[PDB]
Structures are given as structure tokens and as C-alpha cells.
Amino acid sequence: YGIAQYREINAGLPTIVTFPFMFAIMFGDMGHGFLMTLAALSLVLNEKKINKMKRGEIFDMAFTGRYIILLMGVFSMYTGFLYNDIFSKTMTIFKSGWKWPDHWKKGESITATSVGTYPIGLDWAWHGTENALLFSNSYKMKLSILMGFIHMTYSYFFSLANHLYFNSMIDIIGNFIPGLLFMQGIFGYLSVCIVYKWAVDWVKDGKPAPGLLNMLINMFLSPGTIDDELYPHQAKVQVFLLLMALVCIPWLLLVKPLHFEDFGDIMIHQVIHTIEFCLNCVSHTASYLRLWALSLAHAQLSSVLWTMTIQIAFGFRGFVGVFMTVALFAMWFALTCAVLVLMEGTSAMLHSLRLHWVESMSKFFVGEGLPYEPFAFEYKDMEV
Amino acid sequence: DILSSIWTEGLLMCLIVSALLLFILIVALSWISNLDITYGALEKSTNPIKK
Amino acid sequence: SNIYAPLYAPFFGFAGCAAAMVLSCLGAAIGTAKSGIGIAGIGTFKPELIMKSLIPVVMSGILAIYGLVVAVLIAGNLSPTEDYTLFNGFMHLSCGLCVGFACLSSGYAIGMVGDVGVRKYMHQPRLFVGIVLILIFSEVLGLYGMIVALILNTRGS
Amino acid sequence: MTELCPVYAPFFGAIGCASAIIFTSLGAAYGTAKSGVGICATCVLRPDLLFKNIVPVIMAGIIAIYGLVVSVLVCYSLGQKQALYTGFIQLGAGLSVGLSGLAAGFAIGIVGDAGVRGSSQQPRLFVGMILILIFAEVLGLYGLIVALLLNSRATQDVV
Amino acid sequence: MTELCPVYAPFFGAIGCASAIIFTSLGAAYGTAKSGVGICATCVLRPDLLFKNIVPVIMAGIIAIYGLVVSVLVCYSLGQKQALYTGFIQLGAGLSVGLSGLAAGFAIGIVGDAGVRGSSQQPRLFVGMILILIFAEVLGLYGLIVALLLNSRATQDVV
Amino acid sequence: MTELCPVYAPFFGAIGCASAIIFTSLGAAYGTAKSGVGICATCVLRPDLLFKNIVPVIMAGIIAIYGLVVSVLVCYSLGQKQALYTGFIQLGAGLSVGLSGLAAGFAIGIVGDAGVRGSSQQPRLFVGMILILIFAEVLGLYGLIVALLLNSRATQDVV
Amino acid sequence: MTELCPVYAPFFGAIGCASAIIFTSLGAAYGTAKSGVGICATCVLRPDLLFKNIVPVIMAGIIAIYGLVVSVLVCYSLGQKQALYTGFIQLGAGLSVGLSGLAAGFAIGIVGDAGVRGSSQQPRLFVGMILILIFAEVLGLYGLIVALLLNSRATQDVVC
Amino acid sequence: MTELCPVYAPFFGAIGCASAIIFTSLGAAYGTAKSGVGICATCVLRPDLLFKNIVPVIMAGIIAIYGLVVSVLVCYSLGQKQALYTGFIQLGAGLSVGLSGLAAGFAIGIVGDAGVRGSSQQPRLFVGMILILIFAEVLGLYGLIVALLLNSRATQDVV
Amino acid sequence: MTELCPVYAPFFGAIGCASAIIFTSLGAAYGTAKSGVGICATCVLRPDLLFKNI
Amino acid sequence: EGVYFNIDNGFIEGVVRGYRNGLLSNNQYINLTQCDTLEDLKLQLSSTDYGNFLSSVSSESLTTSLIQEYASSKLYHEFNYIRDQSSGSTRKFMDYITYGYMIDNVALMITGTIHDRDKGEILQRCHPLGWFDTLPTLSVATDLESLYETVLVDTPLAPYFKNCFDTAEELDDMNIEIIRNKLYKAYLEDFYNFVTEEIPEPAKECMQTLLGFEADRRSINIALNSLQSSDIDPDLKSDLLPNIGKLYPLATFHLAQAQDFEGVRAALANVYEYRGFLETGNLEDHFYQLEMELCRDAFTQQFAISTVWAWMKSKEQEVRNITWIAECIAQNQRERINNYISVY
Amino acid sequence: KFSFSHFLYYLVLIVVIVYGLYKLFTGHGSDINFGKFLLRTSPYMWANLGIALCVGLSVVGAAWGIFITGSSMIGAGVRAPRITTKNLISIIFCEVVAIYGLIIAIVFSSKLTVATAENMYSKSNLYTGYSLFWAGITVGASNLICGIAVGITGATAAISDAADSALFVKILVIEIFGSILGLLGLIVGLLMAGKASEFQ
């Protein structure tokens, strides 16, 4: 994909670690990771001899990684179990979950009694009618957002980690610092609210509640209030935090023109860089939502597939249903092998690859070196 | 309360928006009526220096 | 309520807003589309003047931003629960379509102008001042639709 | 409500000015684009001539100003309750001047590429140059003048 | 609301005040574009046919004002209240005269281009080209000869 | 038979699924036709990839099930008289999914056969032109979730 | 008579039943027609494929069979007195199969054309093209099953 | 007048009778025109083997007699003591057979054209084409059989 | 008056009767014309069978 | 644009741009200037666009005929594949382009009385792409008039048959040149008709005027050939002069009317494009250079049917100049080494 | 035009006008208007269905963008696979911008509830019905057009590469400029949607 120059903090680590876990959680489930890990098990078993025999089109590049398949599969089981989706199925044996109204009645608006204590991931209280997912998605909105923001800021630190490693203070510090400010002085106000609902329990709190993203509207047209006053003293910093967080970009850029007039050659890249970063921040911010999106999409896929497969042969017949069950499991195999593993994996790896690339490498490999590419004696055979 | 109820025989709202479907049908069909066939590849030259 | 105060004056305002922003974006997108052709074509033999050739495409964005600012200003006068004077509802979409067509016209102009206006300019790069000052006419066109729509909206109750 | 000012009377009363400047902008775009495609065609021949052969490019600004001034000073000619005949005349005023600028643009600048090319080729045509541009421009001054008529007259027959 | 002086009588006159010009402006623009586009060619080829080659554009310009004159003059008798009879007749006169002038513009455009193209190879050819050109612009006179009378009939009974 | 409990549920409940399956058939026919012609043309040149480029066939087949799943959902939910809430929405979801599948059809088609022609001569990315391929699928994948959200909304809680 | 059983309920019924065969037949005919040309393009030149190239006409006539079966099955569910529910459903039910088979034909004609006109050179693509040849009619099968169950529920929901 | 058994119901039946011949005509006519044009190009140099192209047109003749006989049947069923259901079933049967013939004629014409092109050389290939012909003409038989019970079974006991 | 027996009913027949003749007129006009064009093109050098070519 | 040209010519445009950029570079010409013997050319004939397969033709004394033939071989393959992957419009564009390179082929079929040129040699002189399955050229005489009916039936050239039917069997280069000019006029009319019929907006001019100038050069060349002794009917000259060019047509018919040096001078005096008809330095090479400049002046548009029309010209010109330098070395001349008609 | 299709489309243009004038002379034309129909339907037209359209149409807009790009991608790659990675970068812009419509569709489809039997035509829900279309169509159209523009411009760049890779960055600004409207329309539409309310 690309390479860096001397004395540069290469980003091999996050690529190795964080990538496979997005891949897994993307559609992580018991059977998916289980079967693909079994395939990788056979692969590494025959690694002794399979290497000599050539490889299929994809299986060619596949040899670049074999244990990585296990890396993704184990993550897939772990995350799926965390989300209690056994092919989109949740078991109640956790026995913490939630309790219901004693005379809960079908067709009525039922709320699991606010006494349940199951902090471990997700409960079984989401198998009811549409509302469960209806707001689980609404909250999962912020999951990818927050985790990706953390990841990108983590990556961003390495910029100065290399710059000042080179003892560079000419203008690089005065570029990262305005960027760091216009970044955090903006994201922090949202992020504090992201989990503020965790902090503030509105079940028994007689105070105005927020929309999931309510605060944005007044941020632009003369801010100064929250429109429901989610916190009194926070309204002060709502305006005490941006006035300086914005003046950093001109502070970033106006360093050159008095060097000896405007340099011109500098000016073009400088001007483009300012606004392109000012927009790329939000680009990367809005990026991470597919982890949520296609994960739920494949969840729907699995649910519908189960519905149109499993209970089809739910009847109790002995002499006639034999072939019915045989064919039902045959098509279950045909779908489990192909549809649930191939497109899922391709899409997930695409998303993770480029979510790493256009986010991290966007600012890592600002400068790039050259391939040292050593050469020496080797071996070869004869073949047309 | 409509422009003309004679147009209504129990269906005064049912099909009043049933046109954009056909509009999309036709706009897609425009390119459906278009394709490529590249016969030249489907046959091979009698003399190699031809191609 | 007055006939001049029906339940769909905000409806007219929303029509104005939607049309105003969409048309402006259409014009801007067309401008960008037409822009890249000559720029791509010139690098083969003059990767130097490419920087001098920045002005038209980039400068085009004024149309988008201001055809949006009009939508913003007409907004902020409509409540989620109030239906306002009918003439304002009509004025919204009136000035909105005005700007929406002025912007696309200007987009047409500069798009067909700049993309071709430097094709042979590689042969005479000294012509920068002329080839840039030529667009002074095209650029200022859109501005006046907004310069009018402003006081237009200030007027009319 | 009354047919002197029906529900569609206010529609036109607020819409008429809406149709003016648009066509002027269209025509200006067309004409000045066709002007530039000829300008660049041969301006490499003796450059430093673009304030001596700058007529067709600038010429459409005033044509735009037609729609601009009519659509703005229409302000005095607006009313929450104006007659239907008033709305009709306002619509006519707001459309006719705009389409007049459009007709101007139809040819006022299209022939500029054909013409201006001769400056470096046949500079003896300092007379032949402005001819067609003038016969084009003379046409344009017929719309705004008749627009002003109904613009001033909108003050009558209003209810 | 009056079968001899209703409020749709002004409907025939409102857009009538611009119909004649909508026809005539398009006719003139078409004539200008056609018979005045490739002129640069002959001017460069020989810049001494010029002054004779100027008549067709002049005829186009002259015919342009036909539509405007009737509309503006009748606008002295334009209001919301007057006979639908007058509205009928004035509207018809305006439409007919304007479109006849548009036809004149088309004819002059399509004939003058050919005339100038032919004239290149013959200095005498003006004698035939103008000979047939004058026939090209009569249609405006044809229209006005009755449009003016019908406009007078419109004003023969004022409101 | 009212805005509360109409009687025309089957209309929408059936036309939605019909349109879905129709658009599936259209996209499948288009993609399969083009892909077959292109692949059979290319294979003779280098039959080494006789089936190693069949992958577009499989992706084209992918979409062939959405019109079935949504159809069975509405079939379970569909009745004669329901809430007007569950009276019209289904058509939007059905058309959205079908048109998304169609557009993905054109993407896979054109981009993939471009890849195929590139194949026989540039195996430089034979394993690696597949990126252009694996892109489009998200196209169709998009509308499925949004459509099914409202499908569930209409099937479960008429309210 | 209520729209639970109006006069013009079979209005849609009979007409849609008639239409169902139509578009699938049109597709089959168009495909076979413009396929015969590719078939003959070399039959004189290479008549060594005389029985082999018979597939496309069968692949076309299969959707004709499909239209036949759908129409036959729906035939005995029509009458003067029937619920407008039935017409509402059949407003799309029949055309589904009809023009789905039509599109199937539109595709198979062209694929068979290309396959045959490439075949005369290298017989080693026989499996190659026949694969898609047999692949295509899945669209027909889709239409058959979908219309089957759709009309099953439709006639099971007739008010009567 | 009631909408149950309207007197103007049988008009659908009359137009169905009309189409039963209109469409079979159109088809057979176009197909046989192709037949004639091709047989001219062929028979010219092999004018002694035309006997192998006599039936190809009797196929179209039999196609025509389909419309003839269905017209024969529909006569009695067409009446003003009819039910709108009856008129519409007759309409459907007629139009269905007509469009089936429409497809069939085009198909048989194209295939006969190809076969006659081929036949000028091969002495054994006539088998190679009738294959296409039989399974092309079957579709018309499908249409005929379906329409037979479509009308006959429903044209009675209808009230 | 009545829809079964209105005044405008004979309009439909009075038009339909002309429909057939206008249709056949146009059909023959196209057909015999397209025949004659080729017929004369051939007859240019074939005055031997023209009477056989009619 | 977006829709004016973008239907299937996207990757076609990309490959055409990669092709055009892949023209011979000034470094290749400089190294050829280093080449002063045929061996140095051959060894240098591996880093060029035409190299890596154009060497090893012969041990020494290379025949530049084979060098240029195999140099244009790759161009022909590229063009034929460009035709292979195209829509209907570009398909007919290619068909028109290739149907003009058989006019020389039919002229070959016609000119010889009885020579029966080797069928292999027929395709080695003219473009074999427009050529197709064997045509009578060796098994039978290539006579001038009796064979015209045979090719008429065998080859469809009706748009190129524009009163090319005439007396040819007179042992007349008169007949051959007049039929060739009739074919030139006919194909020019056909291809300009296509240009004015279906063509993108910006490339309207760069093809219509380019055909106009090519017809102008055709008229100049045929009238020049007629100056010495071919004084025939001015209408016949018009039948020779491409009537579709119509650039300074007053001057073209001035050529037609007057049969003399004065006639041609006065014709090329009311043109307002360029005066004069004979210039030293292989005047047709000068016209090649002028036409190539005209065609290449429209490379800044990235979606038009002009890029290929100029890239063919550029590539065949590079083949021309490869031959030019090869013979400049062969002729033992070290002054024309820098002389050529390439611009890329 | 000369084609039957366009002449057919121009046929009826004035049939409605003439019928309306005749009925105005008869009386019914004075009783012709859209206000009746404005308040004749239900806001379920205006909310339930005014959602998927923008999503699907922006989806097909990104579809056309990818049609454009994917060609030039391999077109440049085939000659020189020195760009493949560089080829496959800006495409993601088109891939991603498509989901702006899904954002609003999902977030406000949540706000959907029962259209109250009472006040079907008041300042409570029909107002929101209007705004629903308005926002959805608005954003979706903006997104479609941005997608086409970016796809075509990206193809233009991807054909301007075989000449030289170094030219890439110097011309990198065009898509940067293009992509802003994709978020701009999103923000303006979401603002106008949030400021209003839901079925209430």
C-alpha cells in the first residue's frame, strides 16, 4: 500500500491488531469464525506439504497469512458471544438479563423491569418486538464514533512523536498544535455528552433529556445554550471552548508570509492542507459507521435465513419428513459455506483495510522513503 | 373535492403516483437498449499481422 | 385564519429551500465535472501552469455556498407549528428559483469557458493575466441574484 | 376569495419578478462562453489587446442588470392584497424582460468568435467589427423599456 | 364578473402586452444569428462588400419594433376593467402581428445569409440580392395593416 | 375503506413484491447476458481462465433473493384491511431495493467486463482487478437494511 | 355489490391471466428469433454441431412452459363474482412472471448468440457457454415459485 | 344504467373479435414478407429446389386460421345480454392470442430467413432448422390452448 | 339521452366505416408504391416481361 | 461532458491516452542521432516504443521496408483491438477509417494490366486491416476495367463508388489517378458526412476542418500533377478535387477553371490559409507535418474521437521517421539526421 | 421531434389547458385547484414513502460514479501497474458519500409514529409530512449529483496518470473541492429536519 522514510514510527502495530478485530466483530458469530478457523486449522495442518503444491487465485495471496484466519475467527466468536447472537440467537442461561412485569401481555407495551443487573454486554431482553433493535441501533450510533475517534487520536499523536523526535520545531509544532486543538477542543464537548447519559440516569431524573445528537443545532447559529440545558455550567464552555479552538488555523497558516512576502510555492500546499484537513477530520469521523451498519444488515440476513430454514422442518413427522430434513440441512450447508462467509469476509476486509488506510496513512506517510530491496545469491529452477 | 370524481371509481388516490415507477422503468430501459458486442474479439484474424 | 394564511405556507417555504439548494448543487457539480477535462489534458506537456489554472474551478464554489446561504436565511423564519403570511411563502421559492437558475447559468458559463480557455494557452503561458481577467465577467454574475434576494426577503410581510 | 384577487392572484403577485433575471443569466453564460472560446482562439497573436477588444464579454453584464434592477425595484410594486389583473401584469413584466435578455443572448455573443478573430487577421475591419454587435444590441433595448411601463402602472387597478 | 366588461378581459391584454414582443424578438434574433454569423468570412476575404452587406441586419432591426409599438400604445388603454370584446380583439391583433413579424424575421434571416454568400463572387449581385430582400420584410407590414385597425377597435370603446 | 382502515391492502402488498422480483429479473438478465457474452468472447483467447472469471456470475446471483425475502415478509403480513399506516410504505422499500439492485447490475456489468478484457493480456492484477468488483456490492447492501426497518414497522406494529 | 365482491374484480383477474403468458412468450420468441441467425452463421460452414446447438430454443421454450403453467393454475380461480382483493393482487402477480420470463429470454438469446458464434473455432468452450445457458432460467424458477405462493395466499384471502 | 351487466360490455368482445384477426394478420404478413424477400435471394441460383420452402408459408396460413376459428367461436358469445366479466374474458383471450401470434410471426420469420440463407449450400441441413421452427411455433399453441379454456369455460354460466 | 341509447352513438359507426377504407387506402398506397419502384427499376432494361411484371 | 461521450469509452479513453503518451520521445531521436550505422540503430531499436521486437530482422544492411512494416504492425494490432472493444458509433468510425485504406488496395487491384502481384506482397504495401479474405489479385490479371465489375460485386464500395465507373483499360496512368481521386473524393465525402452526422461537440471542428485541410492537400496534389500535362475538363477536375473539403472552395474551383501555373497560383492566392503549392523538402512531408500538428492540437480534451485520429497519425509518423533515419544512415548523409516530420 | 416518442409527449401539452378554459367558460374550471388535493391525502404519503427514495437514488448516483471510475481504473492499470494502489483511492469517496441519505432516513424514520386521526391537517404532522419529502429529496438529489461529478472527475484524473505519477498530488484538489457539498447538503437538510417535528 505504501512505505515511509527514515526514523519514522511505522504503523505496523495498529494495522496488525485493530484490523482483525473490526473484521471479526463486523459479523462475528459462533459458526462463522468456528468453521473458518477449522478451515485454517486444516490449512496449517497441511502447511508441511500444501505449500509445495500451488495455490488457487486467491489462495496464492492467502499464503501471506494463515494464522491470521484464526486471529479473525476467535475474535468473531468472542464478539458474537458478547452480543449474544448464535446465528442471531440469544440464550437466557446468563440468568442475569432482565426481569419483566409479572402480568406482561403480548400486544402490550412491555418494559423489562428496571431492576435487572446484567452489565455484561447485552441481555436477552432484545428478542421481543421491533423496539429492541429500534433503539439498540440508535445507541450503537455512538459506539463506532467514539471508538474510532479514540483510535484516530491515538494515531495522531505519532505525528509529533516523530516530528519532535527529529527535534523539529521550525513550523511542524505550530502545525500539529493548531490541528490538535481544532480537533480536541471540538470533539471533547461532544464526547463528554456521548456517555453523559451513562452518567445521568433520566429514568428517575426530573431534568430535560437530550436528543441523541440534539446539541449540534445551536452550535452554529449563535451558541450559548443547550436548548434543554443538559448541564448548566457546560453552557459556559459551550462558547468558552471554540473561540480559541478556531483561531488556531489562521495561527497555523500565517507563519510564512513574512519570511524573506508570500512564498507562493508554500502557499498552494499550505492553503489546500488547511481546509482539506478541516474537512478530513469529519470525513474520518463519519467513516466508522459501517461496523454498525453492515453488522446489523448481516444480523437481519441471518435472522431471516434462520426463519426460512430452521422452523420449516419443525413438524413432527417420521416417515415423510426424512427427505424434507435432509434437503433442509443440505441447503443449510450450501448457504452456511458460501453466503455467510464469502461476501461477509470480502466486505469486512475491504472496510477494515481502507478504514485503516485513508484514516491513518492519510497523515502517517506524509514523507516516504525508498525500497532498500536487498539482492544477493538465490535459487531458481527451469520451466517454460 | 377532486378535479373530477368520474376519474374516481373507488380509487381516487390509489394510482395518482403510479407514474414515477414507469418513468424509472423507461429511463433504465434507455441504457438497457444499449450494450456492446465486440465481434472483433469473437473472431480471429486470418493473418496474424492483422492484429 | 386568512386565505393568505393557509396551512401550507411553510410548505411553500420548504419548496423554496429544497429547490434553492438542489439547483445550486447541480450547477456546482456540473462545473466541477466540466473542469477536470482540460486540467487532465494539460499535464502531459505542461505540469507547470497547472497551478496557475486553479482559479476557475475553485472560485466556482461561491455559487454553491451562497445559493445555500439564501436557503439558510429564508429558513429561521418558519416555525414547526406556525403557518405564516402567504406572500412570504411565495417570495421564498421566488428568490430561491431566481438564484437556482442564475447559479447554474454561471456554472454553464465558466465550465464551458475555462475548460477550453487554456487548451492552447500552454503555447503562450505569458497570457495568464488575460486568461484570468477574462473570467471577471463570469464570476460576478451570480452575486447579484443574492444581492437582490437579500433585501427582497427583508421586504414583504 | 373574490375573483378580482383570487387565491392565485397572490401567486403571480409574488412570482412575476421571479422569472426575469434567470434568462438573462442564461444568455450571458452562453454568449460570454462563446466569446471566450474565440478570444483564446487567437489572442496569442499580439497579446495585450484585451481592453481594446473587450466589447462582447462585458456587454452581457448590463443585460443581466436589466433583470436585476427590475426584480429589485419591483419591491414597491408588491402587496399582500393586489388585484388579479395586477398579478397578471406583474407576471408579464417579470417574464418578458427576462426572455428579452434571453433572445439578446441567443446571438449577441455567438457571433463574437466569428468576428473578433479578424483583429489580428484583417484589422482593416475596425468598421466591420462593431456592425453586427450593434445590430444585435439594438434589439435588446425593447424589453426593459416596456417592462418599466407596467412596472410603473402596477400602481393602478390594485385591490 | 361582467359579461361586457369582466375581469378576464384584462387576461387577454396582460400577456398581450408581451406576446407581440415574444414573437418579434425571436424573429429578429434568428435573423441576426443566421444572416450575420459568417460575415467575418467575406469581410476577411474581401473587405469592400461591407457597406452593401449591411442592409439585411438593418431590415431585421427595423421590423423588431413592430411588436412593441402596438403593445405599448394599447397599454395606454390597459386596466382590469374593460370589455372582454376588446380583450379578444386586441389580444388576437397582438398575437397575429407578432407572429407575422417572427415569420418576417425568419425569412430575412434565411435569405440574407444566402445573399451575402452569393455576393462574394459578383460585385453586381447586390442588384438581385436586395431586389429579393425587400420582399422578405413585408410580412410585418402584412400583420400590422390589420393589427393596428383591430387595436383601434379595441380602443374604439374604452372600458 | 377510509384513511383509518382502508380496504386496498392487497394492492400495495402484492405490487411491492411483484416489482421487487421484476427488478431482480431485469438486473439478473442484464448482468448475465453481458457477462456471458464477454466471458465466452475472452475465454477462447486464453481458456486458462475458463471459469476463473465466473465470479461476476455469483455476485449477480447474490441479489436474486431480496425480492423473495421481502415478498414472504409482506405475504405473512399482508391482508385486506389494515391501518393506513401500513397502507403505502411498502412500495417505497420495494422500489428502493429493486433499483439499487439494478444499478449494482450496471456497475458489476460494465466494470467487470472491462476487467475481463484486461484479463487475457494483463494478469498483473488477475487476482487483483477484483477490487473494482468487490466495491459495488455495498451498493445493493445499503438499501436492504433501511427497507427492512420499515418492512418490520409495517408487519409488526400497525398502531 | 361490495368491493369485497364487485363486478370488476375479475376485470383484473382474466386480463392478468391472459397477460401472464404474454411477455414470457415474447421474450422466448425474441431470443429464439435472433438466436437462429447465430445458429446458422456457421451451420453450413461447420455442420458438425448439428444436434448440439439445440439448447437455446429449449431454454426459450421453458419460459413458455412457465407462462402456460402459471396461467393454467390461475385459470380456475376466476369468475364474475370475486373479491377486488384478487384483482388488487393480480395487478402485479401475472406481470411478474410474464415479463420476468421476458427478461430471461432477452438475456439467454444474446448469451447463446455469443457462445455459438465463438464455438465454431474452439469446441473447448462447450461446457463454458452451456454453464450460463443452464444458469439463466433460475430467474424463471424464481418467478414461478413467487407467483405460486403469492396467488395461493391471494385466493386463500378471497372475501367471497 | 347499472355497472353489473352494462349494455356496452360486449364492446370489449367486439374489439376482441377484431384483434383476433388484426394481430394474426400483422404477424403472418410481416413474416411472409420476410419469407418472400429471402426466397427471392435464394431461389435465384437454385430455382429448382423451392419445393423445400412451400410449407414455411403454410405455417403462417395455419396461424391465420387460428384467428379465423377463434373469430368463428366468439361470434355467438358476443352479445348485449352479457356480463362485463364475459366481455373482459373475451377481450383477454383475443388479445392474448393476438400477441402470441405477434411473437410467433416474428420468430418464425427470422428463423425461416436464417434457414433459407443456409439452405442454398447444405443439401442435408433442412433438418438443422425445422428444429428451431417447431419449438418456435409451439408458443402459439400454448396461447391457443390457454385461451380456449379461458373463454369457453368462462363464456358460459356467467349470467 | 340514455347511455344505452344516446344521440352520439351513430357517431362511432359513422367513423368506423371510414376507418376501414382509410386504412386499406394507406396500406395499398405504401405497398403498391414500394412494388412499383422496384418494378420500374427492373423494367428499365426489361420491356420484355413488364406485362408479365404487372 | 458526462453523457455526451461517456457510454463505453472510459477504459477506451484510458488506453488511448496511455497509447498517445507512449509516443517516441526526444531521447530516442537523440540516441538515433548517435546511431550512425545500421547496427547502432538495431541495438538502439530496443528502448523505443517500436523496439524489443523490431530487432533481429536481418544480420546487416537492414531493409527499412521491413523495419517500418513491423513497426506499424503493433500500431495496427492496437488499432484493431481498439475497434474490437467499441460501441456502435466508434464501430462505424473504425469501419469508415479502414474503408479508406482499401482505396489504395483497389487501385492496386486495378492498375496493373497483367502482373499478378504476389498475394503476400499486396498486404506488405497497403494496409491489410481493410483487406479481408483472398481477393483476385494473383490468380487473375489485375486489369484496369474488366475487373471493376468483379470488385464491385465482391467488395461493397458504393459510397466510395461515386462515378468511379468509367473507362480504365487504356494503359493510362490518367485512368488510375482519376479513379484514385474519385475514390478519395468519395471517401472524403462519406467520412465528412459521418463527422457532420454523429460527432462530439468539441471535436466537431477538429475533425471537420482537418478533413477539409486533407481534402485541400488532395486537391493541391492532384492539380499539381495536372499542371504539367493533364489539361482535361474542369468538371473532371472537380470530379477529382474532393468536393467535400470546401475550404477556400473559390480557390479550389479556381484551380479547376484555370489550367496553368498562373491558375494554380491565383487559386492559392485567394485561400487565406496558405499560399503556394511547391516547397522544397519533400513537400508532402511538410504537409504531413502540418496535418499532424493540426490533429495533435486537440489532445487537451480527455473525451473525444480526436485522440485516436491523432495517435494513428503520430504512430505512423514515428514509423516514417524511423525509416527516415534508417535511410539517412544508409544514404551516408549526416545532414538530414536532424531532418524529419515528427512533432512528438 | 421527428421521432414518434417526442411528438407523442408534446401531443397532450395543451389538452388540459383547453379543457380547463372550456370548463371555466362552463363553470367547473373555476372549481379547479390543488388545495383540495393538498388536504385530501394523508401525511403517510408525506412521511412513510418520502424516505427510501432519497437513499435509493443517492445509491444509484454513487453507482454511476463507480461506473465511471472503475473503467479508468483498469484502463490506467493495464499499461502500467505502478498506479493500482494509487488508482483505488478516491473511489472510496463515491463509495462512502452515498450513506448520507441513510443517515437521515434512519434517524428520522425513528421519529415516525401514528398520524393522529385528529388534526391530520394541522400544524402538527402534515407540516412534518411536507418537511420529510423536502429534506429527503433535497439531500438525495444533492448526493446523487455530487456522486456523478466526483466519479467523472476521478475518472478524468485516473486517465491523467499514465503520463506520470508525480502529477497526482499537484492535481489532487478537484475531488477535495467536490466532496464538500456532499456534507454541506447533508448538514443543511438535517438542520431543517431537526428544527421541525414529527407526526404529533
Side-chain angles (χ1 to χ4, degrees), chain A residues 20 34 55 57 116 132 138 159 175 188 199 234 254-255 276-277 304 314:
Chain A
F34 157 85
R55 302 163 182 74
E57 166 165 5
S138 84
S159 185
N175 307 325
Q234 200 166 1
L254 272 175
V255 69
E276 68 81 21
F277 197 81
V304 299
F314 190 46

Side-chain angles (χ1 to χ4, degrees), chain D residues 51-102:
Chain D
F51 85 113
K52 191 48 171 166
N53 265 347
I54 200 62
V55 174
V57 172
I58 302 170
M59 185 180 288
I62 301 299
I63 310 194
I65 290 186
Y66 282 15
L68 294 174
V69 301
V70 298
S71 53
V72 58
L73 271 156
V74 73
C75 62
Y76 271 95
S77 50
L78 318 173
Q80 179 45 260
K81 214 178 196 58
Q82 45 197 307
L84 179 57
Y85 155 72
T86 309
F88 285 144
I89 59 171
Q90 297 279 258
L91 183 63
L95 60 92
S96 195
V97 63
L99 59 86
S100 83
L102 203 47

Side-chain angles (χ1 to χ4, degrees), chain A residues 328-340:
Chain A
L328 179 62
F329 177 60
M331 61 79 71
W332 201 90
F333 182 76
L335 60 85
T336 313
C337 69
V339 298
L340 314 178

Side-chain angles (χ1 to χ4, degrees), chain A residues 26 140-141 144 287-300 351, chain F residues 141-142 145, chain K residues 99 102 106:
Chain A
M26 188 66 204
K140 294 152 185 170
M141 295 298 102
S144 60
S287 58
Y288 262 63
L289 313 164
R290 280 81 64 193
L291 319 182
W292 169 79
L294 182 63
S295 61
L296 288 185
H298 191 207
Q300 309 331 293
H351 294 88
Chain F
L141 294 174
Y142 283 140
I145 194 155
Chain K
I99 310 163
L102 280 80
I106 297 169

Side-chain angles (χ1 to χ4, degrees), chain E residues 44-45, chain J residues 250 272:
Chain E
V44 175
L45 266 74
Chain J
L250 76 167
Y272 300 79

